[PDB]
Amino acid sequence: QVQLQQSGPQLVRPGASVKISCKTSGYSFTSFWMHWVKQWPGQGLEWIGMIDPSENKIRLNQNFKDRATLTVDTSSATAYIQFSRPTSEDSGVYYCAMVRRGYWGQGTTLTVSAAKTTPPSVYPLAPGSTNSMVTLGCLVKGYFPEPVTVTWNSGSLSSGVHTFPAVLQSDLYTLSSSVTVPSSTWPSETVTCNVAHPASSTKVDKKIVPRD
Amino acid sequence: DIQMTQSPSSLSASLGERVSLTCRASQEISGYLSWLQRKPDGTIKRLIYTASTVDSGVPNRFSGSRSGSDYSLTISSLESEDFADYYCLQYDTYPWTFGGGTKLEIKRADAAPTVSIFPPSSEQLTSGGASVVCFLNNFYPKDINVKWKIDGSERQNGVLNSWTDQDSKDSTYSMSSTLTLTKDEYERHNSYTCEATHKTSTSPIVKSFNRN
Amino acid sequence: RHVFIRTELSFIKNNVPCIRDMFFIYKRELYNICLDDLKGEEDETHIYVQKKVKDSWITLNDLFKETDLTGRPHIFAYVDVEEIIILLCEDENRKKDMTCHRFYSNDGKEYNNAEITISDYILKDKLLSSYVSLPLKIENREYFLICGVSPYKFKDDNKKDDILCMASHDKGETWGTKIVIKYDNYKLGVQYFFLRPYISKNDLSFHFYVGDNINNVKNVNFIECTHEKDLEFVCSNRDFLKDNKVLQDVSTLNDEYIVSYGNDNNFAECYIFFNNENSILIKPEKTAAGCYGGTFVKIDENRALFIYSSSQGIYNIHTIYYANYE
């Protein structure tokens, strides 16, 4: 019944101290070493280090010697990892774990960037000219940071939906999503793409109308 | 540090197949090797420890073995649950080190891409930008080539591509190609074409439109 | 009446400093479970399984590398005929579950391991100590015992809640069998230490220490137990005290008690008595050494070892054979 609940996602600027928590329950917190593991964006895992809550002793991978600092609070049974002067290199997903027991936290995503939060712009994608199946789409351009979610008719169309990963260019992400419906239901019926950017508190709807 | 070299880095197999991942240690690790599974939702699970011991709750189709410096993880019969990322981890000498990882994907029959091309929207044009989007949907295998032609001449500057992960339902792949020009340079040309070259066809799939 | 005694002395070097020793016999071979826990900035806690080869301990396996346990865990080791089971249990109350790491082996060298949890264990508020033990046969099944003792009591309403044992009949996987120990001579206002069961010929007995209020020493106690109900034992004290000699360890050879003594609380010399008649004198001087910590390690009903650490890293092994010649 061991549980390791980590804190939610964080977006900080370079040089701003950031701290990630991992709250434990269901076992004696001081009886087991606590590890931290980093998932590098688009790559693999790397062991950061481990801390003994009973002795406050630390074994740290020297690749993180002057980057991460591990602490504990035995009164609340929470383990902490802190980046005092984080850089863009420190971006990634951080896991707390009792590695040799097999218990892992869900992970915490940390994004270190100086880029300004920007709302997206949603543009329709409609064909210029037939077949039984017609593919539609809408383009979500120039936003920051991740993520954005896109649904179609508030979630009615789920069978043929693709949402492509965002690509980063000049501190701004752009994303596209596509739907395929039969020529019977379009443009005979409404097709609208619902974009949501929680970071900028943006909820906007764009209907796909056929071209001239 | 102990270098764990893991192979293959990417592997495709069908349901019910047997796959074997190998992890080689740069020095003696005395059997202190673990295999971990990283599911698409970010959760991390321990499969094997001490090289050949299967963790509790792990299905009996997982096993591990050792022959000298080589350690292997074997999945006898592949199930839909088993397609994710896999890492070895030596925990013999500090700092603990991971393998580079293996991405395991599903093998299915070839499928040709559905190619759709979309002119820039007038919404985007009135703001100076001009994005031409080309959807290459639901193809297999994952490798594919898109090429842009403007008035019959190949264009490469300003093209951005995005690739979906393997679809959980049909096990296909999709790719979006976005050619972004300014409104002014988009108006100076007439014909716009994206050609998709794929294993499933000797000749490329050509979709195009004219700006009139 | 018709008995004889043979002894030989041998030495063993150890390359690792052991904070505590736990000797066991596996297939008539002497092993050691060595807790190495220096507290240097660079040091790590090690729990080595060692084996006597020639005149030196050879380290076979560091069990502690498999666990995230902190501190110094309780070590419960069991020797069956073919199997070795070693438990590393967290060193502790408010919590009701005890988590242990179980190690299993068919030979002395290769160990399989997995974690267990003894949820709602019935040894809560009892003092646990590390020891090696044998299986005890109750009815038609064999049990491994984890036993604890109340460290201190002001008033004792029930003389069956002082010593209590947790038992396992599946080679230490699950621990759901309570074995009740009735011990009427459990004294109030007295502190107890280091309870260890001794099992021989399927007979149960306990070896432990008692603190003295007047003088600052811990005295060895030994109680022998008779099996009455299926899961209930009654245990009474057994007197071994003798003048100008301090009781050290107790064992049984040839269906009789063999008992070691020290001359004083510093254990300059050691005396070993067989059925309280024949005695042999241990002089660890030939110097500056002593026989503190001396303990018996039984090999069979006629062959036993008496082991103590002369100096740091050196082990004196007295091999004792005691039997009837007719």
Please state whether beta strands B85-90 and A173-182 pair in parallel, antiparallel, or not at all (unpaired): unpaired
For residues B20, B24, B30, B34, the Cα torsion angle rounded to the nearest 10 degrees is -50
Output the CA torsion sign for B23, B27, B31, B32. negative
In 3D space, the residue among C306, C310, C308 whose CA is nearest the CA of residue C321 turns out to be: C306
Cβ–Cβ contact B137 with A under 8 A: yes
Domain that holds residue C309: 1-326
Residue A55, phi-psi category: left (phi > 0), alpha (psi -120 to 50), beta (remainder): alpha
- Distance, in Å, from the CA atom of B10 to the CA atom of A150, rounded to the nearest integer, reads 30
- Distance, in Å, from the CA atom of C180 to the CA atom of C165, rounded to the nearest integer, reads 7
- Distance, in Å, from the CA atom of A89 to the CA atom of A112, rounded to the nearest integer, reads 8
Output the CA torsion sign for B174, B179, B183, B186. negative
In angstroms, the separation between the Cα of residue B126 and the nearest Cα of chain A is 11
B127–A139 C-beta distance less than 8 A: no
Say which residues have a Cβ less than 8 Å from residue A197's Cβ, sequence separation at least 6. A119, A120, A143, A148
CA-based nearest residue in chain C for residue A97: C68
Structure tokens at C179: 């074995």
Cβ atoms B117, B134 nearer than 8 A: yes
The angle subtended at Cα C98 by Cα C92 and Cα C104, nearest 5°, is 115
In angstroms, the separation between the Cα of residue C39 and the nearest Cα of chain B is 18
- Distance, in Å, from the CA atom of C157 to the CA atom of C154, rounded to the nearest integer, reads 10
Q: What is chain C's alpha carbon radius of gyration, rounded to the nearest angstrom?
A: 20
| Element spanning B130, H or E | strand B129-139
Print the SS3 string covering chain C.
CCEEEEEEEEEEECCCCCCEEEEEEECCEEEEEEEECCCCCCCCCEEEEEEEECCEEEEEEEHHHHCCECCCCEEEEEECCCCEEEEEECCCCCCCCEEEEEEEECCCCCCEEEEEEECCCCCCCCECCCEEECCEEECCEEEEEEEEECCCCCCCCCCCCCEEEEEECCCCCCCCEEEEEECCCCCCCCCEEEEEEEEECCEEEEEEEEECCCCCCEEEEEEEEEECCCCEEEEEECCCCECCEEEEEEEEECCEEEEEEECCCCCCCEEEEECCCEEEEECCCCCCCCCCCCEEEECCCCEEEEEEECCCCEEEEEEEEEEECC
Please state whether beta strands B4-7 and B10-13 pair in parallel, antiparallel, or not at all (unpaired): unpaired
Say which residues have a Cβ less than 8 Å from residue C291's Cβ, sequence separation at least 6. C262, C267, C268, C269, C270, C282, C284, C308, C316
Q: Give partners of B (≥3 CB pairs < 8 A).
A: A, C
Please state whether beta strands C112-118 and C163-168 pair in parallel, antiparallel, or not at all (unpaired): unpaired
Q: Give partners of C (≥3 CB pairs < 8 A).
A: A, B
Structure tokens at C38: 């220096």
A101–C90 C-beta distance less than 8 A: no
Cβ atoms C75, C22 nearer than 8 A: yes
Phi and psi torsions of B77, nearest 5°: -125, 115
B176–A164 C-beta distance less than 8 A: yes
B56–C66 C-beta distance less than 8 A: no
Residue type for position A174? T
**B95 cis-preceded (ω within 30 degrees of 0):** yes
- Distance, in Å, from the CA atom of C299 to the CA atom of C320, rounded to the nearest integer, reads 10
Which residue segments constitute the domains of chain B, with CATH numbers given? 1-108 (2.60.40.10), 109-212 (2.60.40.10)
In 3D space, the residue among B60, B68, B77, B61 whose CA is nearest the CA of residue B33 turns out to be: B68
User: Which residues between 111 and 170 in chain A have a beta carbon less than 8 angstroms from any beta carbon of chain B?
Assistant: 121, 123-129, 133, 135, 137, 139, 141, 162-167, 169
**Strand-pair partners of C224:** C205, C236
A28–C71 C-beta distance less than 8 A: no
For residues A26, A28, A34, A39, the Cα torsion angle rounded to the nearest 10 degrees is 0
Chain C residues inside the 8 Å CB shell of A47:
none
- Distance, in Å, from the CA atom of A136 to the CA atom of C283, rounded to the nearest integer, reads 96
Work out how many domains chain C is built from and give that number. Answer: 1
- Distance, in Å, from the CA atom of B22 to the CA atom of C1, rounded to the nearest integer, reads 68
Say which residues have a Cβ less than 8 Å from residue A180's Cβ, sequence separation at least 6. A133, A134, A135, A136, A160, B114, B137
In angstroms, the separation between the Cα of residue A47 and the nearest Cα of chain B is 6
CA-based nearest residue in chain C for residue A35: C68
Say which residues have a Cβ less than 8 Å from residue C54's Cβ, sequence separation at least 6. none
In 3D space, the residue among A59, A18, A38, B44 whose CA is nearest the CA of residue A7 turns out to be: A18
CA-based nearest residue in chain B for residue A49: B95
Closest in C66, C69, C115 to A31, CB measured: C69
Cβ atoms B136, B145 nearer than 8 A: no
- Distance, in Å, from the CA atom of A38 to the CA atom of A91, rounded to the nearest integer, reads 9
Give alpha helix (H) positions in B49-147: 122-125
Cβ–Cβ contact B208 with A under 8 A: no
Print the SS3 string covering chain A.
CCEEEECCCEEECCCCCEEEEEEEECCCHHHECEEEEEECCCCCEEEEEEEECCCCEEEECHHHCCCEEEEEECCCCEEEEEECCCCHHHCEEEEEEEHHHCEECCCEEEEECCCCCECCEEEEECCCCCCCEEEEEEEEEEEECCCCEEEEHHHCCCCCEEECCCEECCCCEEEEEEEEEECCCCCCCCCEEEEEEHHHCEEEEEECCCCC
In 3D space, the residue among C212, C201, C118 whose CA is nearest the CA of residue C165 turns out to be: C118
Structure tokens at C33: 């479970």
CA-based nearest residue in chain B for residue C44: B94
CA-based nearest residue in chain C for residue B52: C112
CA-based nearest residue in chain B for residue A126: B118
Q: Which of A1, A28, A29, A54 is the best substitution to test chain C (most C C-beta atoms within 10 A)?
A: A28
Cβ atoms B198, B113 nearer than 8 A: yes
Chain B residues inside the 8 Å CB shell of C65:
32, 91-92
Q: CA distances (Å), C118 to each of A124, A196, B207, C87, C172, in order?
A: 61, 49, 67, 12, 10
- Distance, in Å, from the CA atom of B61 to the CA atom of B67, rounded to the nearest integer, reads 20
Kindly provide the b/e burial profile for residues A70-85, where b requires at least 16 CB atoms within 10 angstroms of the residue's own CB: bebeeeebbbbbebee
- Distance, in Å, from the CA atom of A134 to the CA atom of A183, rounded to the nearest integer, reads 6
Name residue, tokens 């880029």.
Answer: A115
A174–B178 C-beta distance less than 8 A: yes
Q: CA distances (Å), A18 to each of A23, C276, C307, in order?
A: 17, 72, 57
- Distance, in Å, from the CA atom of C322 to the CA atom of C278, rounded to the nearest integer, reads 11
- Distance, in Å, from the CA atom of C148 to the CA atom of C318, rounded to the nearest integer, reads 30
Question: How many other C-beta atoms lie within 10 A of the C-beta of residue A102?
Answer: 21
Chain B residues inside the 8 Å CB shell of A120:
none
User: Which residues between 35 and 94 in chain B have a beta carbon less than 8 angstroms from any beta carbon of chain A?
Assistant: 36, 38, 42-46, 49, 55, 87, 89, 91, 94
**Strand-pair partners of C149:** C127, C163
Cβ–Cβ contact A107 with B under 8 A: yes
Closest in B91, B119, B160 to A100, CB measured: B91
Which residue segments constitute the domains of chain A, with CATH numbers given? 1-114 (2.60.40.10), 115-210 (2.60.40.10)
In the three-class reduction of DSSP (H, G, I as helix; E, B as strand; rest coil), residue B3 is classed as coil
Cβ atoms B118, B24 nearer than 8 A: no
In angstroms, the separation between the Cα of residue A28 and the nearest Cα of chain C is 7
Closest in A63, A106, A165 to B162, CB measured: A165
- Distance, in Å, from the CA atom of B63 to the CA atom of A5, rounded to the nearest integer, reads 30
Cβ atoms A78, A20 nearer than 8 A: no
Closest in A27, A35, A99 to C99, CB measured: A27
- Distance, in Å, from the CA atom of C247 to the CA atom of C260, rounded to the nearest integer, reads 7
A54–C71 C-beta distance less than 8 A: yes
Chain C residues inside the 8 Å CB shell of B91:
65
User: In chain A, what's the furthest Cα-to-Cα distance?
Assistant: 73
| Element spanning B186, H or E | helix B183-187
C65–B91 C-beta distance less than 8 A: yes
Question: How many other C-beta atoms lie within 10 A of the C-beta of residue B10?
Answer: 11
A59–B45 C-beta distance less than 8 A: no
User: Which residues between 94 and 113 in chain C have a beta carbon less than 8 angstroms from any beta carbon of chain B?
Assistant: 112-113
CA-based nearest residue in chain A for residue B212: A128
In 3D space, the residue among A154, A160, A135 whose CA is nearest the CA of residue A196 turns out to be: A154
Say which residues have a Cβ less than 8 Å from residue A2's Cβ, sequence separation at least 6. A24, A25, A26, A27, A98, A101, A103
**Strand-pair partners of C77:** C86, C132
Question: How many other C-beta atoms lie within 10 A of the C-beta of residue A47?
Answer: 24
In the three-class reduction of DSSP (H, G, I as helix; E, B as strand; rest coil), residue B163 is classed as strand
Strands ordered across the beta sheet of C270-274? C246-253, C256-262, C270-274, C278-282
A28–C95 C-beta distance less than 8 A: yes
